[PDB]
Symmetry: D3
Subunit: 151 residues, 6 copies
Amino acid sequence: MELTTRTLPARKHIALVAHDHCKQMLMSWVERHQPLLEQHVLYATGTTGNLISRATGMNVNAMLSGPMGGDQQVGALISEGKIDVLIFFWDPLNAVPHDPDVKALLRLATVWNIPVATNVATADFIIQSPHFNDAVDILIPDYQRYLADRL
Amino acid sequence: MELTTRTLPARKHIALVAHDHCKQMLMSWVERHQPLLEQHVLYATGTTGNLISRATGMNVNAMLSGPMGGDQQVGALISEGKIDVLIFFWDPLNAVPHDPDVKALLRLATVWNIPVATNVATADFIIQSPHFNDAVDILIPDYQRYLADRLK
Amino acid sequence: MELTTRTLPARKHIALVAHDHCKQMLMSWVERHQPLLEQHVLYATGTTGNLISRATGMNVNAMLSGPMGGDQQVGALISEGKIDVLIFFWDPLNAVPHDPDVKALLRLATVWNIPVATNVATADFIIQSPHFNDAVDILIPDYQRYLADRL
Amino acid sequence: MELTTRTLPARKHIALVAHDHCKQMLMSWVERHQPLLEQHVLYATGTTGNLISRATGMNVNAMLSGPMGGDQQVGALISEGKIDVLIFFWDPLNAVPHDPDVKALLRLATVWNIPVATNVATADFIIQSPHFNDAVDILIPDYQRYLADRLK
Amino acid sequence: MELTTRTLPARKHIALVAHDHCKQMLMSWVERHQPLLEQHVLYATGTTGNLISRATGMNVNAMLSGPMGGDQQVGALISEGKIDVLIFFWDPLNAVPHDPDVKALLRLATVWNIPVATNVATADFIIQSPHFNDAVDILIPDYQRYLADRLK
Amino acid sequence: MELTTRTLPARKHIALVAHDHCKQMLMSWVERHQPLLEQHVLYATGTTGNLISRATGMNVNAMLSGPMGGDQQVGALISEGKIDVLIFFWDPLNAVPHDPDVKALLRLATVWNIPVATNVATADFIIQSPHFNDAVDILIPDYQRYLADRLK
């Protein structure tokens, strides 16, 4: 497929999503790195976002709750190049009704080549990377060329 | 779960999506009903939308191709109350890589209670219904009450 | 895929299926439209069918409960051309153990091109449509030609 | 889950289903055991059934092709107690569009407790087992009691 | 796809796995056949294995609980040719979080052509088969040839 | 669910897995990072591992091909604490027959809390992270306590 590049801004647009049983996990993680996270732009699904801002006083752009469409709203933003990092703590030990939304979101984050963390270890490694606050060139599919081929 | 209502406008915002093997079907359907479709607002995923406007001269707000995120863009619009009708001709005889996106979109259309057609027969029945060109009231989940309960 | 046609009779054979959390929703819908439904032939999965007839006094051909095979019984009828309309209020906010049966049923209804409603809004639009009470042709795959090709 | 019993007849009603890439395998298996299979009642999905009878001259009750509804027809028969054994050689190395039908069929065969073989080794072990040719009692869910509980 | 053969030893390596709602049924099944099972090598996922040995005093090589990776441990053993029979009583009436692990395990058991039982009826037919205690040859994919083709 | 900790060694055990259409991407990534990868222990699925060592001369512990059980072998290793990092470039634009194995592997990597990369951007961020060469303490589920609760 045709690939091109896009530049992740120094100031990243970060999406924070967590399933109910993983919310405390994300909360702690966020509080632990608040000083650094405050330097970026935060987005979150409904419940997650509200809990975060209510607890840290940080400004979070909250979307709809995941089951109500929040996951697809985030997915859409990712495909539009408006989200640069996804921290998605999904529950691997509980079945969720919106499982297709979960898999769809992770599929898009993989397609659009943005840094994704699905557990604390990966989140820590990503946020501690030296270039987390630098602009970095990532390869992304060349949509214009892709569409032109379909037509 | 508390329910509330929303009014579908007389002029509907229609999303048109079709998997490759079902594109000719959708095309024909759109052309045969062009006179009526011209009175509403059309949205479509990347390839579908371009094929439609290129063939009917109708104005279609094209989003990204489905596999690249178009299905989730439509889903987001539905959940935001910006899409009133979904005509999704998905292929039931072929496995698609973005199957989760397909299922997720149909799940949201079901949750938000908007008219959905996944085959020609259903599409025809919906577009021929008397209140298709009228303002119709639909029951929808009361999100505010729903969220307020989660943050209790 | 060569297509052929089949005629949906004026008096439709309607299958009514509802997941547990969506049962009250279907009940109300059925009661509100009883005068019209009274004019057609009703089929339903085990629990759903019994609740309907017990509440409306309408005659419903009940099949097995969905989890026990009812969804596949309905699917089989659809493929045999014995079901003309499917009203399936499945729960989009709860994971069901027989999810494959659910998806398989919706897949067949799509393949055989019969009117399908998965929510109240769609159900209302379909039942209020002019040809709901008329005999009307629908295009369907030409099975004979399809099988002949596989051999 | 109240349980009851049902008796599998000596002459079994056998469903034979195979995905395209596994058809030659089923054919060989059927031919190898034709003498024994000829004593029972055979059912199959559309293509599989026709290939078998055309090759062995055996009488097979063919249903619709799997993708067109054949798997659900077999599933329905199983739940109605009309199928006693299922030989389903599904392809574990290829994605099929009707995957939900495949999983649904296997789920029903598991629920109704009938012998099921998804590969040759299991098929051979089953067909060589004593009770394959005798009548035997199996436990099955007590549906009447199950339904009575749902309407209480 | 090239096939070759492997010989299941007379003394089989049996994997016993059961979802919570199906544990009592597996327990009864095991106790009911203890005399025979005592002649073979038993493996099981964490909880299942501990319950069995604690109740029958039989020696069971317990792996991790299924949700924590046990199903994949068993799957790995099967692909390595270290498991000859799989008795997997999965719950067809309850959704499990590790559903992909379940399907993956059954997919591998199908690919590697080993006897598999997902319900009591199939388990009984397999364990009563004459050759359950004999060395028996099964057709398995020829991996060496398969890999050589991918690296050609 | 109680938690405990485990220490990822300075010298990491890295699993490298790539679907066919993503193999060239992984190859390039490995070559550009060879100097660093050379200091750790590499594992890979069948085809991937062989292509890597054949091209870089690096020593890779190759397991079975993914469709033949390789993904479950890796998953088993992860659950046993023998894999510390997973670089899995799965294809999001193509349907794979062993999709359940794919999802199962990613589910286990999530459960056991090890660094996981599913695309180049994430892989780059992880390998450039300060502690990639240091011993790091990760929180993992306390299995002993977890099992003890199931056996209560």
